[PDB]
Design a protein around this motif. Structure first.
Motif: not given
Ligand SMILES: COC1=C(OC)C(=O)C(C/C=C(\C)CC/C=C(\C)CC/C=C(\C)CC/C=C(\C)CC/C=C(\C)CC/C=C(\C)CC/C=C(\C)CC/C=C(/C)CC/C=C(\C)CCC=C(C)C)=C(C)C1=O
Ligand SMILES: CCCCCCCCCCCCCCCCCC(=O)OC[C@H](COP(=O)([O-])OCC[N+](C)(C)C)OC(=O)CCCCCCCCCCCCCCCCC
Ligand SMILES: CCCCCCCCCCCCCCCCCC(=O)OC[C@H](COP(=O)([O-])OCC[N+](C)(C)C)OC(=O)CCCCCCCCCCCCCCCCC
Ligand SMILES: CCCCCCCCCCCCCCCCCC(=O)OC[C@H](COP(=O)([O-])OCC[N+](C)(C)C)OC(=O)CCCCCCCCCCCCCCCCC
Ligand SMILES: CCCCCCCCCCCCCCCCCC(=O)OC[C@H](COP(=O)([O-])OCC[N+](C)(C)C)OC(=O)CCCCCCCCCCCCCCCCC
Ligand SMILES: CCCCCCCCCCCCCCCCC[C@@H](O)O[C@H](CO[C@H](O)CCCCCCCCCCCCCCC)COP(=O)(O)OCC[N+](C)(C)C
Ligand SMILES: CCCCCCCCCCCCCCCCC[C@@H](O)O[C@H](CO[C@H](O)CCCCCCCCCCCCCCC)COP(=O)(O)OCC[N+](C)(C)C
Ligand SMILES: CCCCCCCC/C=C/CCCCCCCC(=O)OC[C@H](COP(=O)(O)OCCN)OC(=O)CCCCCCC/C=C/CCCCCCCC
Ligand SMILES: CCCCCCCC/C=C\CCCCCCCC(=O)OC[C@H](COP(=O)(O)OCCN)OC(=O)CCCCCCC/C=C\CCCCCCCC
Ligand SMILES: CCCCCCCC/C=C\CCCCCCCC(=O)OC[C@H](COP(=O)(O)OCCN)OC(=O)CCCCCCC/C=C\CCCCCCCC
Ligand SMILES: CCCCCCCC/C=C\CCCCCCCC(=O)O[C@H](COC(=O)CCCCCCC/C=C/CCCCCCCC)COP(=O)(O)OCCN
Ligand SMILES: CN(C)C(=N)NC(=N)N
Ligand code: SF4
Ligand code: SF4
Ligand code: SF4
Lengths: 70, 170, 318, 215, 156, 115, 176, 96
Positions: B148-149, B156, B153, B107
Motif C-alpha cells: 500500500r505504500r 491508496l 493517491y 539496488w
C-alpha cells in the motif's frame, strides 16, 4: 548590547555591494573603459551598428575620429 | 516478506526502470515466500521448544507461486502498470554488475539476480512452522501491508479483497 | 563575461538572504529584550551556514497524498523568480536594461504568486489548502492597489525605465513629491511579500505553518530563501522608486553604497514592523485595500494625471 | 497546534473559513486526579491542587486549604492569612500576565510576551525564595503556610511592585489603542449576561458581560 | 588514512550543523511547558544557542515531550513523532514524561513516553527549571557531537 | 538572449538545489511518516473536497478592475500627445467610471463576504 | 466598589474630530508602538550567559536528593520509613534490618526520580535530617534506568554535596 | 561618548592578556567582559565578579580546559563547578 547586530548588517551590506560594483566593472571592462551603450531605440541601435562598421575591428566601443577621416 | 523487506519492495520498486525485466519471463521460477511474523514466532518457539535442540527447520509459506504470477500480483496490488519483458541471463548479469558499483547500499547485484531467478527448494524431510505450532500466513492476507505504500493517491484507499489472488502451483 | 555577471548577481543575493535571516533573528531578539544568536559563531555569524547545512542534509519526504510533479515545481518556481526579479534593478547599472522595467517586475511578481498556490494544492492537506486560498485573496487586493500606485508614481517619472527613475530623482525625492502614495506602496509591499501584519499564507497561530506545512529539508529552505529574497528586492525597488540617490557616472560606487544603505534601512523597517504589530484577518485585509486604499489610490491617480498638465511639468518620454 | 494549548482537539466544521460548529474534545490531559486524591491523605493531596491550574498554583492551594480548614473547624493565624492574600495576588499577576501575553501571541504579537515573561521570571524568584520550588510551591497548607518569609522578601516584593506599573503601561502602549488589536478583539465572542449566567461562566467572563459579581 | 581523515572531517561538519541548528516542535502537554516558555524567555534565551520553535513536525528536529502523556494522547504523540523527518531526537522533560510522575498509578496515563517513542535525553524535575532544561538541551548537543555516521559507513 | 540565459541559469540553479536536497541525505520512508498532517490525528475527510469561497464576487470584480488597470497603464506615453485636453478628459472618464463601479458594488453590498 | 473599563465617549468638537481624522489618515498610534519597540531595542538585554552565569537560587531550593551522615561518618537514616509514608508519589522504597552491631539501619533505600515530584515532604518528615533535597539540579541522564537511584548513589550524592548541603541547612534551619 | 565606549572595548581587549586571549574567551565563552578575580578552584575554573552589572550577570565562571580526564576546551558543562563554588555562583550566599 544592540551594537552586536552590526556585524550581521555589515556582512549583508558587503554582500549587497558586490552585484552593483561587479556590474559596473564588467560594463567598463567589455566596453573599453567606458559606460555600456544604452540603446533603447532604433536610432541608438543604428548608431551602435555604424560604430561597429567604421571601427574596423567589429567592436562599437573602438571610437574613431579626425585621425581616421584624415 | 514484510514491511521492511527486500522481496516485495525489490519487485515493486522496479516500476522506476520502465518495464519489469524477467529471465525466461519468470515462467521457470517457483517461489514460496514466508511471512516475517511467522519467521520470528517460529524463532521464538524454537527457543521454548525443548525437543528442537540440535535440529534443522525449513520456514516456508503455504503457497508456491511462479515468479511471473507473483510479480504480476505484486503490481496488481500496488496498482502499477505491469509491463514485463524477457531479459537474457547474461544481460541481466551485466545489469546487476552495473548496479553493484554503488559505494552505498546497492539496488541489485549479480548474486541477487541469481537468487531471484533460482526456484525455492522443496525439503519435505525437514520440520517446519506447523511442527513448531505456527500456522503460516498466506501472502494474500499481508501483501497490502507492504504494497500500500507503493500505491498512488488514486489507489491508496483500495481494500484488501479488491485484487484477485494469484494462481498457485501446488 | 555575462555569465560571470549573472553569477555576481546571484551568489551575493543568496548570501545576503542568509545573513538577513541572522539579522532578523538578532533584531527581533533585541527588540524583545533577548540577544538572538551569538553562540554559533562570533556574534552568531555562522548561524545561517549551520541552518542551511542542516536543512540540506536533512531528509525530504513526499507525502503519500501529494501530487509529486507540482510538489517539486513550486519551490523551483519560487526561487527562480526570486533570483530573476533582480536583473532589471539599476545599482546604478542594470544587468539587463529593459525599456519596460516596471511591467516586467509586476508580471514576474504575479507569476511568483502561483508557487504558493501550487505548493498548497499539491501538498493535499487541509492546512495547505487554507493557506493557498488566503494567498488567493491577498493577491487580489494587493495586486489591484499596487498596479494603480505604480502607474501614478511612474507617471511622475515619464516612462517605465528605472534608470530614468534615477535621472528623475536627481534633485529631490519622489517621497517628497508623493508621500501618500509612498505610504500606501509600503503597506502594499508588505502585503505582497506576506510580511507581518499580513503573514496570512503561513500563519503559525491559525494554521500549522500554512501552505508549506508538508515541506521538509531542502524544499522548505528554497521557499524561505525565495521569501527573503523577495523582501530585499521589494525594499530595493522601493528605495530606487522613492529615495533616489545621487549618481556620478565616473564613480558609480557612491550610488551603490547609497542604494545599499537605503535598502537595508527599509528591510530593517520590515523587521521592526513584524516585531511591533499583531496579525490581520484576511477578510479585514481585503476590506482595508478595497474600502480604504482603493478610493484614495484612484483619487491620487487622477491628481497625478492632472498635475503635470496643469503645471506644465510633463516629463520627457526618453 | 500552537493555538490549541497543547491538548485540545477542536473538531470544527468549516464552510470555507466560517465556523459552523465547534466540538471540543477534551480528556487528552485527563489523569485521574480525583481518584488519586481519594487514595491519598489530606497533606498528600495538596500537590495535586498545585498541578491543576498550573498558572495559579498558590490560588488552587488556597482553595483546598480553605475547604479542609472549614471541615476541620480551625482558623489560620493573621500573619498566615496576610501571606496567603499577598501570594494570591502575586499569583493573580502571574496568571494574568500569562493569559494576556499568550492571547496576544495567538493574535500575532510576541514582544509583550517576552517582556511580561521577564516579569514572570522575577515573580518565580519570589516563589522559589519562600518555597524552594519555582512554580509548584506546595506552600499554602491547611492551617496556615508551611514556613515563614525570609528576611529580605518583603523589600524585594516592594521593589518589584514599585517597578511593575511601567511594564503594564508598555504592554498597553502596544495593544490598547492599536487599531489592529481592536479589529481583532472588538465585537468578537460577545456573550450576553443571561447567557453567561445560565452557561455557568464566572470571573472576567461575567464582568465583561457587565455582571457586578466578585467573590 | 586519507579517506578516514576526510570522512572524519565531513561528519564533524555534518554534526556541527545539526547540533548548532536545533528546531524543537511546538509541543507542550502540561505544566512542564511553562518552564519551556521560560527557557524561550529573555532570561535564558534559547534562540541564542540556535534553538528555534517550529510548528510543523515536518520542519522539526527535536521533540520535547513536556508534560503528562495520557492514553488518549499517545496516538497523537506517536503520529507527530513519525511525521518528523530524520534525523530526529527526543527529550523527555519532567517526571510525567520520564516515568509516571505524580500520576504513575493511574488508569489514564502512560508510564513514560519511552513506551511510545525512543527518548534520547531525560530531564528530571517537577518541573525542571529552565536552567535544567537548558542543561539537557546542551547535553543533547554534546550527544549529537559524538555521532560518527560517515565514520561508521566508511568502515562498513 | 541575455534574458533567456538568465532564466536558464536561475532555473538550473534551483533544479540543482532540489536534486541535491532529494539525493544527498539518508532517506527512510514508511507509510506513517508520509501520511498527511492534521495535528496528530487522522483527517476525517479529503483535502480535495469543495472548499467554499466567501469572496466569489470580489474575485469577479477583481478580474474587471484588473483589466481597467490594463487600460490605465499606457497613460505615461499618452501624456506626450498634443491633444492634452482630450487625453485628460478620457483618462478622468475611465477613472471616474472605475470609481462608480466601486461605489455601486460597495453600496449594493458586493464587498461583503457570504455568511 | 467597581469601575468601568470602556465607557467613555469621544468629544465632537471640530478640533477633536480633526485630531481623530489625522490619527486615522496618519498612523499615529502605530508609530507610537514602533517607538516603544525601538526603545526596547536600545535597552539592555536581560539574558544571562549560561552556562557561565547561573540564575539566583535560595537555601530552600529542592533539587537532587542526598542521604547525609553525622560528623563521625555514621549514616543519619535510622530506617523509620516516615519519608516512605509521607511521600505523595510513592517514590521511596525502604527495607531495613538490624546491622551487625545491632543498629537500626537500611539495607535498601530507593528513590525513583522519574516518579518523584520534588515536593520536599521527605525532608520535612525526616526526624534526623538524613534525607535532604540538595542544591543540584543539573543531573539529566541519557537512559531511564540511570534515574532510579539506590542507597549507594544517594550516599555518593551526600558525600559529594555535603558542604553545600550543610551550609544551606545551617542557613535555613531557624525557619523550620 | 563613542570614544569612551571604544576605549573601554580596547581595555577589554587588553584586559584578557593580548589578542589571543581575547579571541579565546570570545570563542569559548561568547563574552569578553572583565571582572575582578574572586578565586580559582583546584580543577582550574576561575571565578569573576562585577557588582556594577545587573543581578544574575554579576558573577561568572571561566571553565578549565581539562577536568579529571576530559578535554573541556569546548565541551563545558554546568556541572563542572564543585559544590562550594556552585553555591557561590547560584547566589545562595554572598561569601565566596
Ligand atoms: C505548544 O505550546 C507552546 C507555545 O504556544 C504556541 C509557546 O508559545 C511557547 C514559547 C515559545 C515562543 C513564545 C516562541 C515564539 C517566538 C517567535 C514567534 C519569534 C522567534 C523567532 C522566530 C520564530 C524566527 C524563526 C526563523 C528561522 C527558524 C529561520 C532559520 C532558517 C534558516 C536560516 C534556513 C534558511 C536560510 C538558508 C537556506 C541560507 C541559504 C544561503 C545560501 C545557499 C547562500 C550560499 C550560496 C552559494 C552559491 C554558496 C557559495 C558561496 C561562496 C563560494 C561565497 C564565498 C566566497 C568568499 C570570498 C567568502 C512554548 C515553549 C510552548 O510549549
Ligand atoms: C537528472 C539530473 C541530470 C543532471 C545532473 C547535473 C549535476 C547534478 C549535481 C548535483 C548532484 C546531486 C546528488 C548529490 C548526492 C551525491 C550522491 C548521489 O548522487 O548518489 C546517487 C546514488 C545514491 O544511491 P542511494 O539512493 O542509495 O543514495 C542515497 C543517498 N546517500 C546514500 C548518499 C545518503 O548513487 C548511485 O546511484 C551510484 C551507484 C551506481 C548506480 C548505477 C545506476 C545506473 C543508471 C541508472 C538507470 C539504470 C537503468 C536504465 C534503464 C534504461 C536503460 C536503457
Ligand atoms: C538559451 C536559453 C534557452 C532556454 C530559454 C527558456 C526561455 C523560457 C521563457 C520563454 C519566454 C521568454 C523569452 C522569450 C525570448 C526572448 C525575448 C526577448 O528578446 O526579450 C527582450 C526584452 C527586452 O526588454 P524591452 O522590453 O526593454 O525591449 C525593448 C528594448 N530593446 C529592444 C532595446 C531591448 O526582454 C524583456 O522584455 C523581458 C521579458 C521577459 C518575459 C518572460 C516571460 C516568461 C517567463 C517564464 C518564467 C519561468 C520561470 C521558471 C519556471 C520553472 C518551473 C519548473
Ligand atoms: C507628513 C510627513 C511627510 C514626510 C515625507 C518625507 C519622509 C522622508 C522619509 C525618509 C526615509 C529615509 C530612509 C533611508 C535613510 C537614508 C539615510 C541617508 O543616506 O541619508 C543621506 C542622504 C544623502 O544621499 P542622497 O544622495 O541619496 O541624498 C540626496 C539625493 N538626491 C539629491 C539625489 C535627491 O540624504 C541626505 O543627506 C538628504 C536627504 C534629503 C534630500 C532631498 C533634498 C532636501 C529636502 C529638504 C526639505 C525636507 C522637508 C521635509 C522635512 C520634514 C519631514 C517630516
Ligand atoms: C548550503 C546549500 C547547499 C548545500 C549542499 C550540501 C551541503 C552539505 C555538504 C557536506 C555533506 C557531507 C555528507 C553528508 C551526507 C549525508 C549523511 C548521511 O546520510 O549519513 C548517513 C549514511 C549512513 O550510511 P550507512 O551505509 O552507514 O547506513 C545504512 C543505512 N542505515 C542508516 C539504515 C543503517 O551515510 C552515508 O551513506 C555516507 C555517504 C557518503 C557521504 C559523503 C558523500 C557526500 C560528500 C559531499 C561533498 C560535497 C560535494 C557534493 C555534495 C553536494 C554539494 C555540491
Ligand atoms: C567586499 C568584500 C567581499 C565581502 C563578501 C562577504 C562574504 C561573507 C561570508 C561570511 C563571513 C562571516 C562568516 C565567517 C565568520 C566566522 C569565521 C570564524 O570566526 O569562525 C571560526 C571557524 O572558521 C570557519 O570555518 C570559517 C568559514 C568561512 C566559510 C563560510 C562563509 C561563506 C559561506 C559559504 C561558503 C561556501 C564555500 C565553502 C568555503 C569553505 C570559528 O572559530 P573556532 O571556534 O576557533 O573553530 C575551531 C574548530 N576547529 C578547531 C575544529 C577548527
Ligand atoms: C550557506 C552556504 C554553505 C555551503 C556549504 C559550505 C560550508 C562552509 C563550511 C562551514 C564550516 C563551519 C565551521 C564551524 C566551526 C566550529 C566552531 C567551533 O566552536 O567548533 C568546535 C569544533 O567543532 C568540531 O570539532 C568541528 C566542526 C567544524 C569543522 C568541520 C570540518 C572542517 C570544515 C571544512 C569542510 C570539511 C572538508 C574537509 C576535507 C574533506 C566545537 O565548539 P562547540 O562545542 O560546538 O561550542 C560550544 C559553545 N561553547 C564553547 C560556548 C561551549
Ligand atoms: C458615472 C456614474 C453614472 C453612470 C450611470 C450608469 C447607469 C446606472 C448604473 C449604476 C452605475 C453608477 C452607480 C454609482 C452610484 C450608485 C451608488 C449609490 O447609489 O450611492 C453612491 C454613493 C452615495 O452614498 P450613499 O448612497 O448615501 O450610501 C451610504 C449610506 N450610508 O456615493 C457616490 O455618490 C459615488 C458616485 C460615483 C462616484 C464618482 C462621481 C462622479 C462625479 C464626476 C462626474 C462624472 C462625469 C463623467 C465625465 C468625466 C469627465 C472628466
Ligand atoms: C529509465 C530511467 C531509469 C530511472 C533512473 C532511476 C530512477 C530512480 C530509482 C529510485 O529512486 O528507486 C530505486 C529503488 C529505491 O529503493 P528504496 O525504496 O529506496 O530502498 C531503500 C530502503 N531503505 O531501488 C530498488 O530497490 C530497485 C531494485 C530493483 C532493480 C532491478 C534492476 C533491473 C532494472 C534495470 C532494467 C533495465 C534493463 C535495460
Ligand atoms: C525528472 C528529472 C530526473 C530527476 C531524477 C530522477 C527522478 C526521481 O527519482 O525523483 C527524485 C525526486 C523525488 O523522488 P521520490 O519520488 O521522493 O522517491 C525517490 C527518492 N529518491 O525528485 C527530484 O528530485 C526531481 C529533480 C528536479 C527536477 C528538475 C526538473 C526541472
Ligand atoms: C495640494 C493638494 C494635495 C492633494 C493631496 C492630499 C493628500 C494628503 C492628505 C491625505 C493623505 C492620507 C494618507 C493616505 C494613507 C491613508 C491610509 C488609510 O486608509 O489609513 C488607515 C488604513 O491604514 C492602516 O490601517 C495601516 C495598517 C498597517 C500598518 C502596519 C505597518 C504601518 C507602520 C509602518 C509605517 C509606514 C511608514 C511608511 C514609510 C514609507 C517609506 C517609503 C485607515 O484604515 P482604518 O483605520 O482601519 O479605518 C477605515 C475604515 N473606518
Ligand atoms: C501548552 N501550554 C501549557 C500552553 N500554555 N500552550 C499554549 N499554546 N499557550
Ligand atoms: S512533571 Fe510535574 S511539572 Fe511536569 S507536567 Fe508532570 S506534574 Fe507538571
Ligand atoms: S520530594 Fe516528595 S515526591 Fe520526591 S521523594 Fe520526597 S516526598 Fe517523595
Ligand atoms: S524519614 Fe529519614 S530517618 Fe526515617 S526512613 Fe526516611 S530518611 Fe530514614
Amino acid at each position: 548590547m544592540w551594537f552586536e547586530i552590526l556585524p550581521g548588517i555589515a556582512v549583508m551590506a558587503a554582500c549587497l555591494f558586490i552585484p552593483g560594483m561587479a556590474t559596473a566593472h564588467i560594463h567598463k571592462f567589455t566596453n573599453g573603459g567606458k559606460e555600456k551603450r544604452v540603446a533603447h531605440f532604433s536610432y541608438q541601435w543604428n548608431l551602435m551598428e555604424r560604430d561597429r562598421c567604421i571601427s574596423g575591428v567589429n567592436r562599437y566601443h573602438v571610437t574613431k575620429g579626425l585621425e581616421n577621416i584624415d | 516478506f514484510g514491511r521492511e523487506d527486500r522481496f516485495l519492495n525489490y519487485f515493486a520498486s522496479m516500476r522506476w526502470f520502465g518495464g519489469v525485466p524477467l529471465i525466461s519471463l519468470g515462467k521457470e521460477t517457483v517461489k514460496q515466500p514466508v511471512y516475517i511474523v511467522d519467521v520470528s514466532k517460529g524463532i521464538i518457539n524454537a527457543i521454548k521448544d525443548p525437543d528442537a535442540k540440535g535440529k534443522t527447520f525449513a520456514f516456508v509459506g503455504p503457497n508456491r507461486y511462479l515468479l511471473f504470477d507473483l510479480v504480476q500480483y505484486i503490481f496488481a496490488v500496488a496498482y502499477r502498470p505491469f509491463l514485463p519483458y524477457p531479459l537474457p541471463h547474461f544481460a541481466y548479469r551485466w545489469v546487476g554488475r552495473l548496479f553493484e558499483v554503488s559505494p552505498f547500499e546497492p539496488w541489485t547485484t549479480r548474486d541477487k539476480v541469481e537468487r531471484v531467478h533460482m526456484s525455492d527448494m522443496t525439503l519435505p524431510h525437514l520440520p517446519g512452522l506447523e511442527d513448531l505450532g505456527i500456522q503460516a500466513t498466506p501472502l494474500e492476507l499481508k501483501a497490502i501491508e507492504v504494497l500500500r505504500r507503493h500505491r498512488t493517491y488514486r489507489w491508496l484507499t483500495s481494500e484488501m479483497e479488491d485484487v484477485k489472488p494469484a494462481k498457485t502451483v501446488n | 563575461m555575462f555569465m560571470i555577471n549573472i553569477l555576481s548577481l546571484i551568489i551575493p543575493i543568496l548570501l545576503a538572504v542568509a545573513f538577513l535571516t541572522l539579522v532578523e533573528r538578532k533584531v527581533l531578539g533585541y527588540m524583545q529584550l533577548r540577544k538572538g544568536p551569538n553562540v554559533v559563531g562570533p556574534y552568531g555569524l555562522l548561524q545561517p551556514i549551520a541552518d542551511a547545512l542542516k536543512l540540506f542534509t536533512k531528509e525530504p519526504l513526499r507525502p503519500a497524498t501529494s501530487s509529486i510533479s507540482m510538489f517539486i515545481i513550486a519551490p523551483i518556481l519560487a526561487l527562480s523568480l526570486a533570483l530573476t526579479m533582480w536583473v532589471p534593478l539599476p545599482m546604478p547599472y542594470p544587468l539587463i536594461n529593459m525599456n519596460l522595467g516596471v511591467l516586467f517586475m509586476l508580471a514576474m511578481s504575479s507569476l511568483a504568486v502561483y508557487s504558493i498556490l501550487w505548493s498548497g494544492w499539491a501538498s493535499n492537506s487541509k492546512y495547505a489548502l487554507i493557506g493557498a486560498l488566503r494567498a488567493v485573496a491577498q493577491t487580489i487586493s494587493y495586486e489591484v492597489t499596487l498596479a494603480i500606485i505604480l502607474l501614478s508614481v511612474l507617471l511622475m517619472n515619464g516612462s517605465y525605465t528605472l534608470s530614468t527613475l534615477i535621472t528623475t530623482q536627481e534633485h529631490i525625492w519622489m517621497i517628497f513629491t508623493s508621500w501618500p502614495l509612498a505610504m500606501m506602496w509600503f503597506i502594499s509591499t508588505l502585503a505582497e511579500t506576506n510580511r507581518a501584519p499580513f503573514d496570512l499564507t503561513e500563519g503559525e497561530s491559525e494554521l500549522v505553518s500554512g501552505f508549506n506545512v508538508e515541506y521538509a529539508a531542502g524544499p522548505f529552505a528554497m521557499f524561505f530563501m525565495a521569501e527573503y529574497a523577495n523582501i530585499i528586492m521589494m525594499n530595493a525597488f522601493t528605495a530606487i522608486l522613492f529615495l533616489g540617490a545621487s549618481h556620478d557616472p565616473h564613480t558609480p560606487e557612491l550610488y551603490t553604497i547609497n542604494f545599499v544603505l537605503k535598502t537595508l534601512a527599509l528591510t530593517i523597517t520590515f523587521l521592526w514592523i513584524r516585531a511591533s504589530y499583531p496579525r490581520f484577518r484576511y477578510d479585514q485585509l481585503m476590506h482595508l485595500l478595497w474600502k480604504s486604499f482603493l478610493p484614495l489610490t484612484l483619487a491620487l491617480c487622477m491628481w497625478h494625471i492632472s498635475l503635470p498638465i496643469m503645471t506644465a511639468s510633463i516629463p520627457p518620454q526618453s | 497546534h500552537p493555538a490549541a494549548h497543547g491538548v485540545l482537539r477542536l473538531v470544527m466544521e468549516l464552510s470555507g473559513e466560517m465556523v459552523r460548529k465547534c466540538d471540543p474534545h477534551i480528556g487528552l490531559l485527563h489523569r485521574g486526579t480525583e481518584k488519586l486524591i481519594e487514595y491519598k491523605t489530606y497533606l498528600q493531596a495538596l500537590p495535586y491542587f498545585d498541578r491543576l491550574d498550573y498558572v495559579s498554583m498558590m490560588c488552587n492551594e488556597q482553595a483546598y486549604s480553605l475547604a479542609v480548614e472549614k471541615l476541620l473547624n480551625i482558623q489560620p493565624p493573621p500573619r498566615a492569612q496576610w501571606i496567603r492574600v499577598l501570594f494570591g495576588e502575586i499569583t493573580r499577576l502571574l496568571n494574568h500576565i500569562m493569559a494576556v501575553t499568550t492571547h496576544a501571541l495567538d493574535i500575532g504579537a510576541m514582544t509583550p510576551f517576552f517582556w511580561m515573561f521577564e516579569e514572570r521570571e522575577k515573580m518565580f524568584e519570589f516563589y522559589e525564595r519562600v518555597s524552594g520550588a519555582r512554580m509548584h510551591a506546595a506552600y499554602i497548607r491547611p492551617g496556615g503556610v508551611h514556613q515563614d518569609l525570609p528576611l529580605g522578601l518583603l523589600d524585594d516584593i516592594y521593589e518589584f511592585s514599585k517597578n511593575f506599573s511601567f511594564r503594564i503601561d508598555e504592554l498597553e502602549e502596544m495593544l490598547t489603542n492599536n487599531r489592529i488589536w481592536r479589529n481583532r478583539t472588538v465585537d468578537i465572542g460577545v456573550v450576553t449576561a443571561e447567557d453567561a449566567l445560565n452557561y455557568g461562566f464566572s470571573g472576567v467572563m461575567l464582568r465583561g458581560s457587565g455582571i457586578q459579581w466578585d467573590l | 588514512s586519507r579517506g578516514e581523515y576526510v570522512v572524519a572531517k565531513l561528519d564533524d561538519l555534518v554534526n556541527w550543523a545539526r547540533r548548532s541548528s536545533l528546531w524543537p516542535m511546538t509541543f507542550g502537554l502540561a505544566c512542564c511547558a511553562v518552564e519551556m516558555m521560560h527557557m524561550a524567555a529573555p532570561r535564558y534565551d534559547m534562540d541564542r544557542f540556535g534553538v528555534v520553535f517550529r510548528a510543523s513536525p515536518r520542519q522539526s528536529d527535536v521533540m520535547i515531550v513536556a508534560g503528562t502523556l495520557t492514553n488518549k494522547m499517545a496516538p497523537a504523540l506517536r503520529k507527530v513523532y513519525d511525521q518528523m523527518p530524520e534525523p530526529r531526537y527526543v527529550v523527555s522533560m519532567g517526571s510525567c514524561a520520564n516515568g509516571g510522575g505524580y500520576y504513575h498509578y493511574s488508569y489514564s496515563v502512560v508510564r513514560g513516553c519511552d513506551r511510545i517513542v525512543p527518548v534520547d535525553i531525560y530531564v528530571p524535575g517537577c518541573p525542571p527549571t529552565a536552567e535544567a532544561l537548558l542543561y539537557g538541551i546542551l547535553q543533547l548537543q554534546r550527544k549529537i557531537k559524538r555521532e560518527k555516521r560517515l565514520r561508521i559507513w566508511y568502515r562498513r | 538572449m541575455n534574458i533567456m540565459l538568465t532564466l536558464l541559469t536561475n532555473v538550473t540553479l534551483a533544479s540543482l538545489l532540489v536534486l541535491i536536497a532529494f539525493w544527498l541525505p539518508q532517506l527512510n520512508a514508511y507509510s506513517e511518516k508520509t501520511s498527511p498532517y492534521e495535528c496528530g490525528f487522522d483527517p476525517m475527510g479529503s483535502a480535495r473536497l469543495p472548499f467554499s469561497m466567501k469572496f466569489f464576487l470580489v474575485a469577479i470584480t477583481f478580474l474587471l478592475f484588473d483589466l481597467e488597470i490594463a487600460l490605465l497603464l499606457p497613460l505615461p506615453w499618452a501624456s506626450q500627445t498634443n491633444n492634452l485636453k482630450t487625453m485628460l478628459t478620457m483618462a478622468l472618464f475611465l477613472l471616474i467610471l472605475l470609481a462608480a463601479s466601486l461605489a455601486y458594488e460597495w453600496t449594493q453590498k458586493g464587498l461583503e463576504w457570504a455568511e | 466598589t467597581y469601575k468601568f473599563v470602556n465607557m467613555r465617549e469621544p468629544s465632537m468638537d471640530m478640533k477633536s474630530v480633526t485630531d481623530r481624522a489625522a490619527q486615522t489618515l496618519l498612523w499615529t498610534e502605530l508609530v507610537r508602538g514602533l517607538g516603544m519597540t525601538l526603545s526596547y531595542l536600545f535597552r539592555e538585554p536581560a539574558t544571562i550567559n549560561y552556562p557561565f552565569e547561573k540564575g539566583p537560587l535560595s537555601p530552600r531550593f529542592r533539587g537532587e536528593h542526598a542521604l547525609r551522615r553525622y560528623p563521625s561518618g555514621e549514616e543519619r537514616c535510622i530506617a523509620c520509613k516516615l519519608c516512605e509514608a509521607v511521600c505523595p508519589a510513592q517514590a521511596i522504597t525502604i527495607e531495613a534490618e538490624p546491622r551487625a552491631d545491632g543498629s537500626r539501619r537500611t539495607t535498601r533505600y530507593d528513590i525513583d526520580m522519574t516518579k518523584c515530584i520534588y515536593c520536599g515532604f521527605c525532608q520535612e518528615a525526616c526526624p534526623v535530617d538524613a534525607i535532604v533535597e540538595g542544591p543540584n539540579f543539573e543531573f539529566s541522564t541519557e537512559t531511564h534506568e540511570e534515574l532510579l537511584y539506590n542507597k549507594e548513589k544517594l550516599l555518593n550524592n551526600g558525600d559529594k554535596w555535603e558542604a553545600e548541603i550543610a551550609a544551606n541547612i545551617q542557613a535555613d534551619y531557624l525557619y523550620r | 561618548e563613542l570614544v569612551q565606549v571604544l576605549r573601554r572595548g580596547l581595555q577589554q581587549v587588553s584586559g584578557h592578556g593580548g589578542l589571543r586571549g581575547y579571541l579565546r574567551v570570545l570563542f569559548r565563552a561568547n563574552d569578553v567582559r572583565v571582572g575582578t578575580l574572586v578565586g580559582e578552584d583546584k580543577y582550574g575554573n576561575k571565578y569573576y565578579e562585577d557588582n556594577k552589572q545587573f543581578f544574575g550577570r554579576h558573577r561568572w565562571v571561566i571553565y578549565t580546559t581539562e577536568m579529571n580526564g576530559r578535554d573541556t576546551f569546548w565541551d563545558v558543562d554546568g556541572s563542572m563547578v564543585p559544590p562550594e563554588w556552585h553555591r557561590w555562583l547560584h547566589c545562595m550566599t554572598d561569601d565566596p
